[PDB]
Nucleic acid binder design. Structure first.
Lengths: 60, 115, 656, 225, 40
RNA sequence: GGGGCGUCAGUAUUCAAUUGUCAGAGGUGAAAUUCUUGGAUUUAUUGAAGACUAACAACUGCGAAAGCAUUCGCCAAGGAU
RNA sequence: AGAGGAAGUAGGUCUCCGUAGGUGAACCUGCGGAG
């Protein structure tokens, strides 16, 4: 009644995307911890970019 | 593709799968979480959200809209500002049974200053 | 207790379909699909289907196939086999396919048995062969919800569809080109065609038909148009001049000249074309049963359909009549103990008294009572003497037929009279039961309390209180204390009926026991989810149980019959046991062995076998020494052979 | 499976979708697409004709499906509807709202946002409120972590912001105001003219609210469509 | 444990029924089972 | 983001009204009290009232201390240079 | 309704062909025929 099954198997018409903004002291740590994040988000199917110029993480 | 707007009120005690037209005024079909589970303990559960989303998608495919814009919310005044398990499980079951999803937005009431 | 008989739902919500043989009829209940003969009414067959509610079904004019489609996107075809006897049919599946991406809402089958067309919720509409799963040609594709179809020929075949907006489009199946006609403003509900006149009728939800109040079904015969809409009336019109001569569906037989009306009270009305009989589809949620007549041939049931129905118990399914005087919901019901007066309490604030005229079709509501400002919850009856009405509020009242009082805090529940009419008790939600003087405005006392809230009282010709907890108590007049207390339920009890006691539950079980003993005698488990009310035959012991589920079950007592059967069984047992002892004493080993194999007890059978194999004077040709025992061992039956083998292994264990 | 209710509460269920009809929605002039959806409203008759409810309702729709451009995944607009035709639903501007995801996606630490509110009236006598937000520019080739404007500098920025939005929204009508709101000309001109006081990272107008519309004129309302 | 419902099995391995068993043999079988119970 | 007076907003909560409702909602570890076909919870739009000023918000600022965060106007005062 | 007294019982695969639909050359599904 409480357990949840993993999703077995295009369900999106409008290509959704989200953004968040981070400062510089987090920009360093995110720059050298990012490939783990984009590896797991590629296993989930979502493209994740990081922008050290503006300081923005985007998923889409 | 006729877009209907699905309000998913996911709290910790019960989940509300609600389907309206684009206006917000005319409710098409709603199935609460607790009317599919005999136990008030398990009223807010992923199984309850899955059953509610399957019934709502079945009714709205009998009416023939087959496309939803999903607005997810929770108790936001002095509450938690996070959806319960109903949101994830209802969106999963809703798009697993037909229902090309359109635009997803989490419209939680965020107070500028409450108390 | 055995089921005497049940009455059952035949129709709830979905689409009905009639074959050209007007015997068989296929209708819907929930997810299931049930088909019955109309004239004898018995359950021919029931296909279960999947878990989702059924969307639409059809039967072919020749009743050979039954095509169902659910709210889950699927479509199942069943072939049917009808005997010379129309009493029972067997459906077997042939094809299950998923027609479109949306569940289909409309179907239409041609007058010949070879093509069926289906129309979905997105607009993708197709045509299939019935004998084998084809798509012989796809006709439109998904545009807008198809709301109607009609197959026709011109005197090769053509098919017309009517969409959710007002768009009627006709195409030839051989030419394979669609052409619209002009197009229409609102939801076209149905399309019909007359081949005698070369004329297409379109009936729509904007109260118009093109060659009102609303329109759901129109058609031809015959030269006489018909119309059915939200007005509740079927109307007949001339074809050639437009002077004449709710409903969810109506079909046209007219070779058998019967037109079926699917009224949104979930009833089915048969109209003759120049009310034959009607059948109630579902008694939706039954609030009270009362078993009425002098001879008690005709029970009145009362439910959410804003009226009361009188249906016979002695064909068994035919409702005698329908009686409508109330406005909101008929809630409770009570008959006099001396025959002919039934009375109805309601969610409307008015209560009323009706006559029952058995040897007529006349039923009148000639006594009415305004009363108080809230809903008359319950009615009690001692021309009748008078009426005591209860209430949703605290205002209890009493009024004479051609006064108020305050009783409790919350909504009261039930009311009951003694057969002599000297006492009267009322029950409510604030755990008090109140008896008072019935002639004056005086009070005889008070029952002390039933733990949560008392639901039903009963007088013994001793008062019985069934309450909101899982208990039931028996109280007295003398001390106003409980004589007896009983447990054992799993929900509310909601009804307590005297026998010639029984109690229903809200845990769908109805259980009987006796008062002086005080322990449970029997329990009964027919119904679906809930159980509300119990009626009783007044002469013999027959229980009529009904609830929120639509089925009503009639039980009869069999305790006298099984006691007579057990008595004569013990008589035959002692007689044949003594004739066994007689044959043993006389030495008639043959009939002794036959009677021992009949009486099934083997400690004497072994002694007979040791004797017959050591008789000291054996016949030389015989197998076991006696030719007669050889004869019975040759003429043993299969069950006696197997039981003898099951004793032979046990005798073969012992080396003696 | 088992019900829960009290005695005599479930009424007989009536079909509510016999009395419902669909109505296609057209957007006003300055948006790129016109057919934006479909609304299920009640069936008209005497005793509350449905055109009163159709005059009452408003819609909320994003700008991505209007301009066909996913640059505007945010900035949801609101459309009143005051007119009706045959199977049609003509609409007008009512307000413009962000998404709270972008409102969280714009706020960073060690930088200042400046908010400004104006109550301005167009030449068609519509009163409306414009809520502008403006985040402070972190200058490239800098080393200090906090780009804090002084409080007097913030007050000067807010004064120039309200001066720009008043001077460039008081002169035009509502249709030209929406045509200037769509490619964000106002935020661009605030960014261009405030950079002599303190440079601003991004100026947006986060809300437009129409308070009162004193006229119902089908002439201009159909000159839109 | 593998006998019939009406019958008993003896120590000899022979099915004898309680109905055909007399009162004296019933009393003696009750006494023998009670003697075993007293021994244990 | 020192103080006083006025003013301007912002949401959120409660209350009420108008619609679409159509069986539970609410709490809890479970429950129960309670509100619920005169329609609760929910959906949308308005109106009123009282409160508070999210995110920015800091190894910061101001005030002697308690303390002080919506905009704008007025009134004096104060710090450093 | 009551503590005692006395007693008894324990069933069409493969291949091909003609179809009708699907996403089209092909290919898939369903059917009707021949090997």
């Amino acid at each position: 009644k409480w357990k949840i099954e993993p999703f077995l198997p295009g369900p999106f018409l409008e290509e959704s995307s989200f953004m968040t903004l981070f400062p510089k002291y987090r920009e360093r740590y995110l720059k050298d911890c990012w490939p783990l994040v984009t590896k797991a988000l590629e296993k989930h199917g979502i493209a994740a970019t990081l922008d050290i110029v503006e300081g923005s993480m985007t998923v889409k | 593709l006729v877009f209907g707007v699905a309000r998913i009120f996911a709290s910790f005690n019960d989940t509300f799968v609600h389907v309206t037209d684009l206006s917000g005024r005319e409710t098409i079909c709603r199935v609460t979480g607790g009317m599919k589970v005999k136990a008030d303990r398990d009223e807010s559960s992923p199984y309850a959200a899955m059953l509610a989303a399957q019934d709502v998608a079945a009714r709205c495919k009998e009416l023939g809209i087959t496309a939803l814009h999903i607005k997810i919310r929770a108790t936001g005044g002095n509450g938690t500002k996070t959806p319960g398990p109903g949101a994830q499980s209802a969106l999963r079951a809703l798009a697993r049974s037909g229902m090309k999803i359109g635009r997803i937005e989490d419209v939680t009431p965020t107070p500028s200053d409450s108390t | 207790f055995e089921v005497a008989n049940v009455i059952q739902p035949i129709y709830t919500g979905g689409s009905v379909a009639l074959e050209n043989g007007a015997r068989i009829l296929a209708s819907t209940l929930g997810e299931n699909a049930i088909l019955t003969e109309l004239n004898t009414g018995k359950r021919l067959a029931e296909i279960q289907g999947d878990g989702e509610p059924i969307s639409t079904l059809t039967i072919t004019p020749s009743g050979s196939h039954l095509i169902v489609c659910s709210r889950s996107l699927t479509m199942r075809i069943y072939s049917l086999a009808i005997s010379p006897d129309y009493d029972s049919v067997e459906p077997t599946l042939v094809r299950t396919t998923k027609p479109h991406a949306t569940p289909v809402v409309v179907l239409a089958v041609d007058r010949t048995s070879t093509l069926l067309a289906t129309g979905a919720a997105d607009g993708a509409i197709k045509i299939w062969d019935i004998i084998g799963g084809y798509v012989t040609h796809t006709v439109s594709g998904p545009s807008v919800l198809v709301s109607a179809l009609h197959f026709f020929e011109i005197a090769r075949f053509r098919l017309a569809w009517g969409t959710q907006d007002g768009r009627i489009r006709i195409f030839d199946l051989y030419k394979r080109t669609t052409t619209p006609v002009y197009a229409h403003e609102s939801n076209v509900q149905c399309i019909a065609y007359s081949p005698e006149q070369h004329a297409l009728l379109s009936g729509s939800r904007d109260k118009t038909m093109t060659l009102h109040e609303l329109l759901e079904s129109v058609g031809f015969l015959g030269k006489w148009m018909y119309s059915a809409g939200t007005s509740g009336v079927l109307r007949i019109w001339d074809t050639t001049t437009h002077h004449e001569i709710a409903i969810l569906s109506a079909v046209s037989l007219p070779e058998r000249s019967l037109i079926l009306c699917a009224q949104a009270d979930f009833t089915l009305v048969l109209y003759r074309v120049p009310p034959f009989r009607r059948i109630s589809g579902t008694h939706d949620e039954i609030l009270d049963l009362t078993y009425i007549l002098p001879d008690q041939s005709m029970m009145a049931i009362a439910t959410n359909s804003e009226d009361i129905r009188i249906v016979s118990v002695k064909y068994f399914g035919h409702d005698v009549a329908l009686l409508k005087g109330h406005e909101d919901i008929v809630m409770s019901l009570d008959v006099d103990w001396s025959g002919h007066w039934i009375a109805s309490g309601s969610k409307d604030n008015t209560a009323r008294l009706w006559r029952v005229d058995p040897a007529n079709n006349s039923y009148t509501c000639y006594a009415v009572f305004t009363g108080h400002l809230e809903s008359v919850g319950a009615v009690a009856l001692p021309p009748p003497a008078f009426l005591i009405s209860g209430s949703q509020d605290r205002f209890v009242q009493k009024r004479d037929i051609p006064l108020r009082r305050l009783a409790h805090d919350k909504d009261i529940n039930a009311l009951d009279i003694s057969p002599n009419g000297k006492l009267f008790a009322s029950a409510s939600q604030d755990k008090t039961v109140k008896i008072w003087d019935v002639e004056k405005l005086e009070v005889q006392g008070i029952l002390r309390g039933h733990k949560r809230g008392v639901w039903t009282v009963r007088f013994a010709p001793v008062v019985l209180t069934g309450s909101g907890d899982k208990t039931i108590k028996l109280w007295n007049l003398s001390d106003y204390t409980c004589i007896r207390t009983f447990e054992g339920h799993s929900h509310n009890v909601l009804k307590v009926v005297w026998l010639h006691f029984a109690s229903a539950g809200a845990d769908t079980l109805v259980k009987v026991w006796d008062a002086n003993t005080g322990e449970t005698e029997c329990t009964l488990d027919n119904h679906e989810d809930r159980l509300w009310t119990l009626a009783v035959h007044s002469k013999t012991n027959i229980l009529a149980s009904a609830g929120s589920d639509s089925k009503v079950t009639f039980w009869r007592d069999t305790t006298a019959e099984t006691q007579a059967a057990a008595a004569q069984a013990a008589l035959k047992l002692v007689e044949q046991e003594q004739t066994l002892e007689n044959y043993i004493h006389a030495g008639a080993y043959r009939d002794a062995i036959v009677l021992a194999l009949q009486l099934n007890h083997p400690g004497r059978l072994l002694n007979l076998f040791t004797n017959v194999v050591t008789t000291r004077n054996p016949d030389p040709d015989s197998l076991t020494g006696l030719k007669a025992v050889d004869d019975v061992l040759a003429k043993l039956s299969d069950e006696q052979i197997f039981q003898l083998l099951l004793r032979l292994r046990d005798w073969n264990t012992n080396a003696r | 499976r088992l019900s829960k209710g009290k005695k005599g509460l479930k009424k007989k269920v009536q079909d509510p979708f016999t009395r419902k009809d669909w109505y296609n929605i057209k957007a006003p002039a300055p948006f790129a697409v016109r057919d934006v959806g479909k609304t299920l409203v009640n069936r008209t008759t005497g005793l509350k004709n449905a055109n009163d409810a159709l005059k009452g309702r408003i819609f909320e729709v994003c700008l991505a499906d209007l301009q066909k451009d996913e640059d505007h995944a945010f900035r949801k607009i609101k459309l009143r509807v005051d007119e009706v035709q045959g199977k049609n639903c003509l609409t007008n501007f009512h307000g413009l709202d962000f998404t709270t995801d972008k409102l969280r996606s714009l706020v960073r630490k060690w930088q200042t946002l400046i908010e400004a509110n104006v109550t301005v009236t167009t030449t068609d006598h519509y009163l409306l409120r414009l809520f502008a937000i403006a985040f402070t520019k972190r200058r490239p080739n800098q080393i200090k972590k906090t780009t804090y404007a002084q409080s007097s500098q913030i007050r000067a920025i807010r004064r120039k912001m309200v001066e720009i939005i008043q001077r460039e929204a008081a002169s035009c009508t509502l249709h030209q105001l929406v045509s200037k709101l769509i490619p964000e000309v106002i935020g661009r001109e605030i960014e261009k003219a405030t950079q002599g006081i303190y440079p601003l990272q991004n100026v947006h107008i986060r809300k437009v609210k129409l308070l009162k519309q004193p006229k119902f004129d089908l002439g201009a309302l159909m000159a839109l469509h | 444990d593998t006998a019939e419902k009406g019958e008993v099995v003896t120590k000899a391995g022979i099915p004898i029924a309680k109905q055909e068993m007399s009162r004296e043999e019933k009393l003696r079988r009750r006494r023998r089972e009670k003697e075993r119970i007293r021994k244990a």
